[PDB]
Design a protein around this ligand. Structure first.
Ligand SMILES: NC(=O)c1ccc[n+]([C@@H]2O[C@H](COP(=O)([O-])OP(=O)(O)OC[C@H]3O[C@@H](n4cnc5c(N)ncnc54)[C@H](OP(=O)(O)O)[C@@H]3O)[C@@H](O)[C@H]2O)c1
Ligand SMILES: N[C@@H](CCC(=O)O)C(=O)O
Length: 416
C-alpha cells in the first residue's frame, strides 16, 4: 500500500505512547514543502529528454533538512515523502541539528551514459537550487547515486552561487578531493556495529564467538559482516544476496566473499559453504540477524520462525508492524531501522560540519564522535523502551518526535 500512508500510519500508532497535541500531530502528518520540477538534459543522440525530479522538505524545526537523492525508475512522490518523514525521525533520534528531507529523479541510470549522468545531476541542481543550500537543505547519496554525482552537483551549485558562501556544505557524501569526509564509506555499518555492541551490553550476552547472519551482501551488508568479524569478534556463518545465499558452520571471511562476488555471479556457490536461500538465512540459528537487504523480509509468515536474539535493522523497513509485536512476544531485541543505520547520516553531519568550519578531522576523531552519538542514541531509546514497557520502535519514535515537537513548540509553530 501507499508508502506515505504507511509512514503516517506508523507515526499515528506510535503517537499513542506519548503526549502530543492534535495540531502538532497534524502538522507532522504532512511535509512542510514539496517541490516537483522538470529536469531536461541533452542526450547523446542530441535529443532533449525531460525527467521528473522531486525534493521534499518534511520538517526543518530542528535545523536544515537532510536527505539523499534517489535515481530509480520506480521512484514516486509518495516514496520520497515517506523517506523524508523517516529522515526527520532519523536525525531527531541521534540528536542532530537537522530536519528531514529527501529527493529523487524518475530515471534509469544504467541506460544513461556518463555525460548524460553529469548533465542530469547539473540540471537537477539548476532546477532545485532555490530550495536547497548549506543552511537550507543538504542532499546526500542514495540508491543509484554516488560520490561522483555528489561532486558534479556540488560543482554546479557552486557555479550558480558564485562562491559567495560555503559551497562544499550544500551536499555530503562527496569525494575526499573536494570537501569529503573520512569514514563516510563505512558509516552505516559502523553505526550498526555500535548499536549491536550496545544491545549486547544491555542484554548481558558476550558477543565474541557468536553467530551472525547478514542478508544482502551490498555496501552496507558486507561492511556490517566485516566489522562484526573484526571489532566485535563475531562469527559470520551466513550471508545472502539477491540470487541466493551461502552458509558455513565454521564461518566465512568477508574479504574472500567480496572477492568472489567480483569474479562470479553474486555470492552463489561458495567453495566451502552450503548454498541456501533467503528465508533459510532469516530463520537460521544466529545470535545477531542483520537484514541489510530490501524491505519487508521479516513478515507474519516467517515472524515466528525467527530465532535471533538481536535483529539489527540495517535496511529501511525490513520488519512489518505485526512482525514487531510477534518478535517482542518472542523476547527478541529489535533495533529500529532509523536508529540502527543512523551512522550514515551522523557521518554526513560530520562532513557538513567540517565543510562549514573549513577545518577537517581525522579518522579517529570521526570514529570516536560517531561512537559517542550512537551510544547515546541507543541508550536513550532503550531507556525509553524499559521505563514505559513499549516496543523499541515505539520508544525510538517517542524520542524523535519528542525532540521535533519540542523544537516546534520553541519556535512557536504550534502552541499546545
Ligand atoms: O543497502 P545498500 O546500500 O547495501 O544497497 P546496495 O549496495 O544496492 O545492495 C543491497 C543488497 O541487497 C541485495 N538485494 C537486492 N535485491 C534483493 C532481494 N530481492 N532480496 C534479497 N537481497 C536483495 C543486493 O543484492 P545484489 O547486489 O545482487 O543486487 C545487495 O546485496
Ligand atoms: N540515512 C541516509 C544517509 C544519507 C544522508 O546523509 O542524509 C539514507 O541513507 O537515507
Amino acid at each position: 500500500i501507499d508508502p506515505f500512508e504507511m509512514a503516517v500510519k506508523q507515526l499515528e500508532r506510535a503517537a499513542q505512547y506519548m503526549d502530543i497535541s492534535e495540531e502538532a500531530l497534524e502538522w507532522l502528518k504532512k511535509p512542510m514543502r514539496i517541490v516537483e520540477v522538470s529536469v531536461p538534459i541533452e542526450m547523446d543522440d542530441g535529443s532533449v529528454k525531460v525527467f521528473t525530479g522531486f525534493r521534499v522538505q518534511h520538517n526543518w524545526a530542528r535545523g536544515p533538512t537532510k536527505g539523499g537523492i534517489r535515481w530509480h525508475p520506480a521512484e514516486t512522490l509518495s516514496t520520497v515523502k515517506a523517506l523524508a518523514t523517516f529522515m526527520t525521525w532519523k536525525v531527531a533520534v541521534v540528536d542532530l541539528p537537522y530536519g528531514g528531507g529527501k529527493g529523487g529523479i524518475i530515471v534509469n541510470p544504467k541506460e544513461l551514459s556518463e555525460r548524460e549522468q553529469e548533465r542530469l545531476a547539473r540540471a537537477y541542481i539548476r532546477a532545485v537550487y532555490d530550495v536547497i543550500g548549506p543552511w537550507t537543505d543538504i542532499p546526500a547519496p542514495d540508491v543509484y547515486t554516488n560520490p561522483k554525482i555528489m561532486g558534479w552537483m556540488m560543482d554546479e551549485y557552486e557555479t550558480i552561487m558564485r562562491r559567495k558562501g560555503p559551497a562544499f556544505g550544500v551536499i555530503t557524501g562527496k569525494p575526499l578531493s573536494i570537501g569529503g569526509s573520512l569514514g563516510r564509506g563505512t558509516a552505516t555499518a559502523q553505526g550498526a556495529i555500535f548499536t549491536i555492541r550496545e544491545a549486547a551490553k544491555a542484554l548481558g550476552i558476550d558477543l565474541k564467538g557468536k553467530k551472525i547472519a547478514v542478508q544482502g551482501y551490498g555496501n552496507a551488508g558486507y561492511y556490517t559482516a566485516k566489522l562484526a568479524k573484526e571489532q566485535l569478534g563475531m562469527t559470520v556463518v551466513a550471508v545472502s544476496d539477491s540470487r541466493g545465499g551461502i552458509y558455513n558452520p565454521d564461518g566465512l571471511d568477508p574479504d574472500e566473499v567480496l572477492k568472489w562476488k567480483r569474479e562470479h555471479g553474486s555470492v552463489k556457490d561458495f567453495p566451502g559453504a552450503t548454498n541456501i536461500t533467503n528465508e533459510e538465512l532469516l530463520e537460521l540459528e544466529v545470535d545477531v540477524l542483520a537484514p541489510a537487504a530490501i524491505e519487508e523480509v521479516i513478515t507474519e509468515k516467517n515472524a515466528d520462525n525467527i530465532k535471533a536474539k538481536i535483529v539489527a535493522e540495517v535496511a529501511n523497513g525490513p520488519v512489518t508492524p505485526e512482525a514487531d509485536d510477534i518478535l517482542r512476544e518472542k523476547g527478541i531485541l529489535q533495533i529500529p531501522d532509523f536508529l540502527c543505520n543512523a551512522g550514515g547520516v551522523t557521518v554526513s553531519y560530520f562532513e557538513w560540519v567540517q565543510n562549514i568550519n573549513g577545518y577537517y578531522w581525522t579518522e579517529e576523531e570521526v570514529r570516536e564522535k560517531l561512537d559517542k552519538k550512537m551510544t547515546k542514541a541507543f541508550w536513550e531509546v532503550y531507556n525509553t523502551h524499559k521505563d514505559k514497557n513499549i516496543h523499541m520502535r515505539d520508544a525510538a519514535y517517542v524520542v524523535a518526535v519528542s525532540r521535533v515537537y519540542q523544537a516546534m513548540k520553541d519556535r512557536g509553530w504550534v502552541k499546545k
